[PDB]
């Protein structure tokens, strides 16, 4: 090729970066999600509705493991998610090849956010349109982080990304507390996902993964049908 090598992002006269603020609009128009850090675990939940009655549910997953104690969800556009997932898989093994020890969840977000930094500054590529929620129970205490397409990150107690996130932000503030159990945390994680769901919620409309200290675990639809079985 030619080797053009020029970035598509410069400063405004006001001082803002224009294309990064446009990419957050595609994040806010994605599928909704919610993540709650409990006293003994981290609960992730999402909204998985098909556009037809034809689409199989055992093909594409939303809750996705990274290591056996680290999972990762998203709210944004579909195909850009699988890039950084496969990037985070190869990145997490390189820590294990050097140190012979599974990566802590703080150290993983130090490097995944640097990958999302690199597509904002380099030449001719566009920034991501996917924000994340990264979880895990390493060294006793569990963790729950959130990374944006700008390249920064945070540390939440309970948050919600996707559509109608300003309604779920007030609802989690009025419902969460200092501590719960993990089994109580899933109950307030569907009730904040029932706020913005459609008229029917089944075992195949939602999809829930958890983080015990025993490791990472995503739930089969047998438990999720039994969990929404008249317990709200």
């Amino acid at each position: 090729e030619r080797g053009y090598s020029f970035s598509l992002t410069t400063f405004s006269p006001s001082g803002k970066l224009v294309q990064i603020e446009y990419a957050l609009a595609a994040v806010a128009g994605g599928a909704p999600s919610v993540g709650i850090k409990a006293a003994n675990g981290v609960v992730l939940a999402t909204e998985k509705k098909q556009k037809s009655i034809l689409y199989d549910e055992r093909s594409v997953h939303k809750v996705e493991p990274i290591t056996k104690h680290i999972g990762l969800v998203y709210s944004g556009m579909g195909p850009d998610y699988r890039v950084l997932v496969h990037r985070a898989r190869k990145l997490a093994q390189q820590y294990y090849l050097v140190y012979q020890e599974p990566i802590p969840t703080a150290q993983l977000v130090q490097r995944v956010a640097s990958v999302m930094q690199e597509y904002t500054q380099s030449g001719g590529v566009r920034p991501f349109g996917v924000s994340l929620l990264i979880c895990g129970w390493n060294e006793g205490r569990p963790y729950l982080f959130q990374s944006d397409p700008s390249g920064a990150y945070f540390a939440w107690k309970a948050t919600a990304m996707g559509k109608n996130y300003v309604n779920g932000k007030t609802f989690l503030e009025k419902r969460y507390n200092e501590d719960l159990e993990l089994e109580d945390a899933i109950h307030t994680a569907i009730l904040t996902l029932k706020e913005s769901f459609e008229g029917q919620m089944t075992e195949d409309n939602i999809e829930v993964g958890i983080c015990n200290e025993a490791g990472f675990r995503r739930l089969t639809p047998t438990e999720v049908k039994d969990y929404l079985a008249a317990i709200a």
């Binding site: 050097v98 140190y99 012979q100 020890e101 703080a106």
Partner: protein, 204 residues
């Protein structure tokens, strides 16, 4: 050989709640000494030391390369390093020079940063880790050091008798060696403090 160009002897020994490490002091070319203050034990954080023996070039080289990677590790993470983690770090550094290898054999001794649990291990010149429960030795006079430690070691030892056992093991074995000697320094660490003593050895 190349290992027999400068000499050296590094011994570590596990106690009850404590761990000890000792080395010699002689620096020299094949038959001619130079000085008696050559450092072979380097602190890598509190309550965790490392000992090096072999070619005197790679002793000073690897101890600076490992210090280069340790400080970058202890700033990305606020915690200190675990003794299992350092053993995986050194084995990575030696294996990168698979066919251009450094001529040294490291010995790592230290306590757990959270609990009081001691840890000893030794590696080969290409990075084979080997953990034990009683003692590890490295250097030119290795066979003399196995003869002393197999007969004098006891399982559960206070820091008094652990110092006296590693003292008699180092003095009687290095005096049998020709290219090692000229003083023995002993580090004995524990949960509360770190004690460093030098011994009265033969200066011939």
């Amino acid at each position: 050989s190349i290992m027999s160009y400068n000499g050296g002897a590094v011994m570590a020994m596990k106690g009850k709640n404590c761990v000890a490490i000792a080395a010699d002091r002689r620096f020299g070319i094949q038959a001619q000494m130079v000085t008696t203050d050559f450092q072979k034990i380097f602190p890598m954080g509190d309550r965790l030391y490392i000992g090096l023996a072999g070619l005197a070039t790679d002793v000073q080289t690897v101890a600076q390369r490992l210090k280069f990677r340790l400080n970058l590790y202890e700033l990305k993470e606020g915690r200190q390093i675990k003794p299992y983690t350092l053993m995986s770090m050194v084995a990575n550094l030696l294996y990168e020079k698979r066919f251009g290898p450094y001529y040294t054999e490291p010995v790592i001794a230290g306590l757990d940063p959270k609990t009081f649990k001691p840890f000893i291990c030794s590696l080969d010149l290409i990075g084979c880790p080997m953990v034990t429960d009683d003692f590890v030795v490295s250097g030119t006079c290795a066979e003399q050091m196995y003869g002393m430690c197999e007969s004098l070691w006891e399982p559960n030892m206070d820091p008094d008798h652990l110092f006296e056992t590693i003292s008699q093991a180092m003095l009687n074995a290095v005096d049998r060696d020709a290219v090692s000697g000229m003083g023995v320094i002993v580090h004995i660490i524990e949960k509360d403090k770190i004690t460093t003593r030098t011994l009265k050895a033969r200066m011939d």
